[PDB]
Amino acid sequence: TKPTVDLLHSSCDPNAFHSTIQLYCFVYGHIQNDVSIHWLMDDRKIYETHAQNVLIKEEGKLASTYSRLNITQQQWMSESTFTCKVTSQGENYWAHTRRCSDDEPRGVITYLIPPSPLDLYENGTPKLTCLVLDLESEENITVTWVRERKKSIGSASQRSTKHHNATTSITSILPVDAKDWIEGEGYQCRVDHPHFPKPIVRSITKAPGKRSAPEVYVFLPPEEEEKDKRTLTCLIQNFFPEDISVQWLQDSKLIPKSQHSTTTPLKYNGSNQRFFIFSRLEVTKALWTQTKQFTCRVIHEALREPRKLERTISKS
Amino acid sequence: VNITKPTVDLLHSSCDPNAFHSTIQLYCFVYGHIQNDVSIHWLMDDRKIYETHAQNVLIKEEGKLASTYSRLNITQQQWMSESTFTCKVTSQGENYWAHTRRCSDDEPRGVITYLIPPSPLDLYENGTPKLTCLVLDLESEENITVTWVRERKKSIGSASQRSTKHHNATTSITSILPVDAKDWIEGEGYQCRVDHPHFPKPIVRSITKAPGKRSAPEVYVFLPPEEEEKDKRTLTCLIQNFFPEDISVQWLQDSKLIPKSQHSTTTPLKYNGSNQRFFIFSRLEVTKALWTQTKQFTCRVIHEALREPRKLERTISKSL
Amino acid sequence: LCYILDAILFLYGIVLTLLYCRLKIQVRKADIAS
Amino acid sequence: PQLCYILDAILFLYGIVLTLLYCRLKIQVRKADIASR
Amino acid sequence: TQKSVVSLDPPWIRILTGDKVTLICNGNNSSQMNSTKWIHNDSISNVKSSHWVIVSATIQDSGKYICQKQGFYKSKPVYLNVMQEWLLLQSSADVVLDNGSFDIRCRSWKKWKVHKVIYYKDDIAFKYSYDSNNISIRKATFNDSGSYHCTGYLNKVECKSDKFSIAVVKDYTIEYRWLQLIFPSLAVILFAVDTGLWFSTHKQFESILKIQ
Amino acid sequence: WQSFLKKELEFLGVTQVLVGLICLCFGTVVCSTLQTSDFDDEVLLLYRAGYPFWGAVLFVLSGFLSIMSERKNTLYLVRGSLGANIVSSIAAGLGIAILILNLSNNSAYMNYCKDITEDDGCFVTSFITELVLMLLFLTILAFCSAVLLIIYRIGQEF
Numbered sequence A: 001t002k003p004t005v006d007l008l009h010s011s012c013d014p015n016a017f018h019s020t021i022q023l024y025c026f027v028y029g030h031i032q033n034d035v036s037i038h039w040l041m042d043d044r045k046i047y048e049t050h051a052q053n054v055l056i057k058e059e060g061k062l063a064s065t066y067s068r069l070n071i072t073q074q075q076w077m078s079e080s081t082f083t084c085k086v087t088s089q090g091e092n093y094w095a096h097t098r099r100c101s102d103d104e105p106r107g108v109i110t111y112l113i114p115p116s117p118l119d120l121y122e123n124g125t126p127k128l129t130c131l132v133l134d135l136e137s138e139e140n141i142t143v144t145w146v147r148e149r150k151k152s153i154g155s156a157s158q159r160s161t162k163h164h165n166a167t168t169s170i171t172s173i174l175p176v177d178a179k180d181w182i183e184g185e186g187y188q189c190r191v192d193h194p195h196f197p198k199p200i201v202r203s204i205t206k207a208p209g210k211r212s213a214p215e216v217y218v219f220l221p222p223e224e225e226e227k228d229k230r231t232l233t234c235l236i237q238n239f240f241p242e243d244i245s246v247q248w249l250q251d252s253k254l255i256p257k258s259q260h261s262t263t264t265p266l267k268y269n270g271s272n273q274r275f276f277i278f279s280r281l282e283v284t285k286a287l288w289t290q291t292k293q294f295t296c297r298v299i300h301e302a303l304r305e306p307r308k309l310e311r312t313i314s315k316s
Numbered sequence B: 001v002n003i004t005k006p007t008v009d010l011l012h013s014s015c016d017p018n019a020f021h022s023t024i025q026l027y028c029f030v031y032g033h034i035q036n037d038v039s040i041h042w043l044m045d046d047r048k049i050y051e052t053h054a055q056n057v058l059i060k061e062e063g064k065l066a067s068t069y070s071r072l073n074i075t076q077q078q079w080m081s082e083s084t085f086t087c088k089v090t091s092q093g094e095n096y097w098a099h100t101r102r103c104s105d106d107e108p109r110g111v112i113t114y115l116i117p118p119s120p121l122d123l124y125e126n127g128t129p130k131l132t133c134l135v136l137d138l139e140s141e142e143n144i145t146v147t148w149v150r151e152r153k154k155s156i157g158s159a160s161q162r163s164t165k166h167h168n169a170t171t172s173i174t175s176i177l178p179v180d181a182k183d184w185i186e187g188e189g190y191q192c193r194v195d196h197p198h199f200p201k202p203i204v205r206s207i208t209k210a211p212g213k214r215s216a217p218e219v220y221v222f223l224p225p226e227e228e229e230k231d232k233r234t235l236t237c238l239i240q241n242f243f244p245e246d247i248s249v250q251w252l253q254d255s256k257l258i259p260k261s262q263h264s265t266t267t268p269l270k271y272n273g274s275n276q277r278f279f280i281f282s283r284l285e286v287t288k289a290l291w292t293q294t295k296q297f298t299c300r301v302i303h304e305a306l307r308e309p310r311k312l313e314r315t316i317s318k319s320l
Numbered sequence C: 001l002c003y004i005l006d007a008i009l010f011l012y013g014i015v016l017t018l019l020y021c022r023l024k025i026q027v028r029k030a031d032i033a034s
Numbered sequence D: 001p002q003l004c005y006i007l008d009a010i011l012f013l014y015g016i017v018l019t020l021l022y023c024r025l026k027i028q029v030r031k032a033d034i035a036s037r
Numbered sequence E: 001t002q003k004s005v006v007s008l009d010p011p012w013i014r015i016l017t018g019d020k021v022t023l024i025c026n027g028n029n030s031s032q033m034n035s036t037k038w039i040h041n042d043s044i045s046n047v048k049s050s051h052w053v054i055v056s057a058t059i060q061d062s063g064k065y066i067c068q069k070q071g072f073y074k075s076k077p078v079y080l081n082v083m084q085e086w087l088l089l090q091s092s093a094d095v096v097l098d099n100g101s102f103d104i105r106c107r108s109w110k111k112w113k114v115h116k117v118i119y120y121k122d123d124i125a126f127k128y129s130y131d132s133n134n135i136s137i138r139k140a141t142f143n144d145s146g147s148y149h150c151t152g153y154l155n156k157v158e159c160k161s162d163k164f165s166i167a168v169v170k171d172y173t174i175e176y177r178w179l180q181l182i183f184p185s186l187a188v189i190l191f192a193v194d195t196g197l198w199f200s201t202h203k204q205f206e207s208i209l210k211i212q
Numbered sequence F: 001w002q003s004f005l006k007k008e009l010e011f012l013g014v015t016q017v018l019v020g021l022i023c024l025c026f027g028t029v030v031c032s033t034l035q036t037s038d039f040d041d042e043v044l045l046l047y048r049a050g051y052p053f054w055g056a057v058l059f060v061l062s063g064f065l066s067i068m069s070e071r072k073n074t075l076y077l078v079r080g081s082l083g084a085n086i087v088s089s090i091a092a093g094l095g096i097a098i099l100i101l102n103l104s105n106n107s108a109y110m111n112y113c114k115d116i117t118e119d120d121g122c123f124v125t126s127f128i129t130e131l132v133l134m135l136l137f138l139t140i141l142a143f144c145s146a147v148l149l150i151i152y153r154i155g156q157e158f
């Protein structure tokens, strides 16, 4: 049998002075009367644990107990590795906890941006971006990329930029495979520097949740409108997750992204997450009257192949 | 019937760079409660968490007493923000709390002050504009004074002040100064200053009306989409070409107001190439049975640059 | 600037010197006839 | 600089000399006028 | 021998309340007593040591300081400025000669730590540092004249400091050049008297002219 | 020489008044404009001893009682204005020594001045030096006038 050994701990209570943190070593499903718990810090044993082995429940042979360890605040803030040793059926089990390292050493901000749906499902050349901001200088900063299953990663292109506030930024872009992203591969971007006490580690994966295909409706220019300009709107709603791509067409010809706008998605009533956006394209009367048709196509990961849904609007 | 207090614990897991999930799991253990008479609710910085669907698991039953726990999943970015997570245990009409944070140092977090302007609805429809000076992140509310000073006249109104204590062991102070609509319209500049004996200088924030070339809005209302035949109906209201961005939108249902929680409005988007024009979309979704009651909906909007009485309403009905 | 002011002051001095010479010679000749 | 200050000193001395001579002429003409009275 | 020189030994002309500042006369590493005369705000103080140590600066400790070591001349005045702010841009000097050097800082109130400091000159940022330390500007030219200020982060709140003006000049201004204008101002008065004396003399001389 | 001695008497009495008034003007401007706590007490020895004020007062008083003895010729005027001339001569004699000492002090200070406009100290010292030179010239003139006037008033009682 394989007990589910998991380590839980308390933390600061803002309403109390709280000069103590408690460590728990839960063992679930272990064989009854066949459990032993030992505690070590920094891979060295401690004897004055003053543990309290309290059983939880019994289900036939299976049973659940736990132990309590009372450490000081400074023993936790030292970032020492605390490990629990479980002795069941002669086998040995382990579980480690540490205080999580600072994610902004020297005030450096790191973002991991996922691939866009347009590249993922239309172009076929997705890319992950790791943006490192608020750098005093570019020198001695190294960026590394780690996959999950294979050791073969691509070549990452890195550029530096000095902004108007005299701060340097580094942008590393790694081309990724669409299929591996689809199955749910994880990727990391480890930034390192000699003056960093610990490396910066950021992870990303495909967004979790329950998918739902969007519904798109297009509206004619308002009948109250007979002025110089004409406005066309696109309504996309009832989709999850937030990643969507919308582009306008004019007689099967792409329109630059600076000629139309799109609103930030808003959550809709819960509890299951749903979003809606509005896309607006304003054209002049002369262009609108040139006897053509317009299109509003979207790309989403919840649609059937080829993951494209389009709606055409015309006066004819 | 006596009240038996239970013990509430708030445990969680730890971060792991070597992993890829990038999630943190929280447990709210409660022991010695009464069967089928408990309810665990999760909060994050005084804000209820809805989109999480926390899972409730029973541990054991000991006679009239029993023990359960509820698990919550959060992200690494939320945990790293040093935000307080609370689980509220409700038993026989009584509430028991448990808080947790990230173990950090004793830095004296600074004081942030926000000054907000009156809403156009009160300025041009209700007639009772008010200002608000929101003061946050105070260790305690003592020795704090807030004063209001105008620029043109010297007759200020009575500014009521209130205090609040939060779950993250911080105190907030809000003071409301009722002002005159006309005086605001003409371009007066008020300011709010907060003073403490330990402050080297008072914290001062100033506010006036938005400067720029005014433009009256134009509003259009669209019928429910033709392709829609489901059990719901969507009604939208396009408001564009207005300045400034301070606008008020309210939907009417047979001359009866609809609560603000039943419709949502997008944030204004600037366009027109430095001409400083905005546009918003207002969306109200009503069900098919509610829509099919031969009503007459309305999209009433109040803006500064509109002609008197500063309101524009569009009527939509299924008959026409 | 200071040279320019010196120029006007020197002009004033020259004018006064010439006038003084004229007045002195006039009074001397008037007293001679006396 | 120094040259302008030297010029200023020269002008001051010139003024002194001129006012002294004009005072002498004034007293002489005044004496003559009272003599004619 | 020559003139005395007074120099603070924190080299900051702008300090916050509670800062420690020591004032030094002609200059040595010794607090020699009964050998120095100190003048503050045009009033001689009771301090007679070679060092004037202020353990806790107060708003009343600002103004002007002059020291006169025994057997020497009075020193050129130096100005001290004590204030109370959230963020203060300290500077070593406010007027710098050509090919001179001066430092700046961004300091907070009562040992509070500032982070993510950006230094601006004429509303244009020229440096950024995580910590608040020296920014040494060596071999100053005319390009280093303008209004300076810094915007750092307090405990967690962004704060902005007031603008400070530093000017680089070829030579110092001597603040008393109008004194040399007394001599030209006196000549015009004496010359005006000369013109007045002509009119009286000519009028009197004309009286004899009419008599004849 | 007595015929010459008459006409000069009035004019030297006049020039004493002018010398005194210029001395007073210099004293007033120096007292008002300058902040004397920033400068040395040996550079300002002329003004620290108050020479302009008690020099101007005595010079004006001597002038007033030398331009009256040639207009009224009263018996209390002569032998009543010679005490106003002896003290004036004494004051003029002391002023020359004071101004010489101040000039020596100014030279000693200006030794350690690489330029006339190095700072406020050197500039103010140079201005005081030239003011002292002009004051010395005027004081010499006034002393000569007083000495001549005393010679005249003592020659007719010999």
Ligand SMILES: *[C@@H]1O[C@H](CO)[C@@H](O[C@@H]2O[C@H](CO)[C@@H](O[C@@H]3O[C@H](CO)[C@@H](O)[C@H](O)[C@@H]3O)[C@H](O)[C@H]2NC(C)=O)[C@H](O)[C@H]1NC(C)=O
Pocket (backbone or CB within 6 Å): A109, A111, A113, A131, A133, A134, A163, A164, A165, A167, A169, E116
């Ligand atoms: C100095 O100036 C630069 C550029 O003006 C600032 O960098 C900007 O920082 C903001 C927030 O830190 C970035 O916005 C972020 O963008 C990501 C990716 O879209 C998004 O996921 C985040 O939610 C956030 O909106 C912004 O992209 C970034 N600018 C660039 C060009 O990358 C920097 O913060 C300034 N530093 C100081 C100390 O003022």
Ligand SMILES: *[C@@H]1O[C@H](CO)[C@@H](O[C@@H]2O[C@H](CO)[C@@H](O[C@@H]3O[C@H](CO)[C@@H](O)[C@H](O)[C@@H]3O)[C@H](O)[C@H]2NC(C)=O)[C@H](O)[C@H]1NC(C)=O
Pocket (backbone or CB within 6 Å): B044, B045, B046, B047, B082, B083, B084, B109, B112, B114, B116, B134, B136, B137, B166, B167, B168, B170, B172
């Ligand atoms: C402790 O918990 C309280 C309650 O959640 C936190 O107060 C909240 O603080 C945020 C920003 O600090 C406030 O957001 C601001 O709201 C104003 C008003 O609309 C808006 O103008 C600003 O742009 C900003 O979005 C929020 O209103 C405020 N909530 C309440 C109820 O006052 C507080 O920050 C927490 N402190 C710590 C140290 O965790």
Ligand SMILES: CC(C)CCC[C@@H](C)[C@H]1CC[C@H]2[C@@H]3CC=C4C[C@@H](OC(=O)CCC(=O)O)CC[C@]4(C)[C@H]3CC[C@]12C
Pocket (backbone or CB within 6 Å): D023, D026, D027, D030, E186, E189, E190, E193, E200, F014, F017, F018, F021, F022, F025
């Ligand atoms: C104030 C400083 C800058 C200038 C000082 C010089 C003049 C302004 C004053 C000071 C002495 C005054 C002089 C003193 C007395 C006399 C005698 C007086 O002689 C007469 O009485 C002639 C009769 C007459 O015409 O009134 C002529 C004016 C004069 C020179 C006064 C003219 C005006 C003087 C020169």
Ligand SMILES: *[C@@H]1O[C@H](CO)[C@@H](O[C@@H]2O[C@H](CO)[C@@H](O)[C@H](O)[C@H]2NC(C)=O)[C@H](O)[C@H]1NC(C)=O
Pocket (backbone or CB within 6 Å): E041, E059, E060, E061, E062, E063, E064, E081, E082
């Ligand atoms: C010395 O003079 C300075 C002025 O140069 C004085 O500083 C002022 O002090 C008052 C308080 O009495 C403040 O209100 C002013 O703001 C200060 N002025 C400046 C420019 O900071 C100082 O107090 C004087 N000290 C003494 C002992 O007289």
Ligand SMILES: *[C@@H]1O[C@H](CO)[C@@H](O)[C@H](O)[C@H]1NC(C)=O
Pocket (backbone or CB within 6 Å): A020, A022, A050, A051, A069, A070, A071
């Ligand atoms: C265990 O730690 C908790 C921390 O609050 C403390 O109260 C308790 O006394 C400790 N028990 C033992 C046996 O050390």
Ligand SMILES: *[C@@H]1O[C@H](CO)[C@@H](O)[C@H](O)[C@H]1NC(C)=O
Pocket (backbone or CB within 6 Å): B023, B025, B052, B053, B054, B055, B071, B072, B073
């Ligand atoms: C939290 O994450 C764990 C691990 O993926 C999962 O087993 C569990 O169901 C999650 N909890 C909720 C409430 O989704």
Ligand SMILES: *[C@@H]1O[C@H](CO)[C@@H](O)[C@H](O)[C@H]1NC(C)=O
Pocket (backbone or CB within 6 Å): B142, B143, B197
């Ligand atoms: C704060 O106010 C109280 C009474 O309101 C007063 O006693 C106290 O001295 C003030 N200051 C501090 C630091 O408590």
Ligand SMILES: *[C@@H]1O[C@H](CO)[C@@H](O)[C@H](O)[C@H]1NC(C)=O
Pocket (backbone or CB within 6 Å): E010, E011, E092, E103, E134, E136
């Ligand atoms: C920093 O500046 C101070 C004061 O100007 C000076 O004493 C110190 O030597 C400087 N240190 C560095 C490293 O520049």
Ligand SMILES: *[C@@H]1O[C@H](CO)[C@@H](O)[C@H](O)[C@H]1NC(C)=O
Pocket (backbone or CB within 6 Å): E141, E143
């Ligand atoms: C000073 O600024 C001017 C203006 O741009 C520039 O032309 C000049 O090169 C600058 N000085 C130096 C030494 O670069």
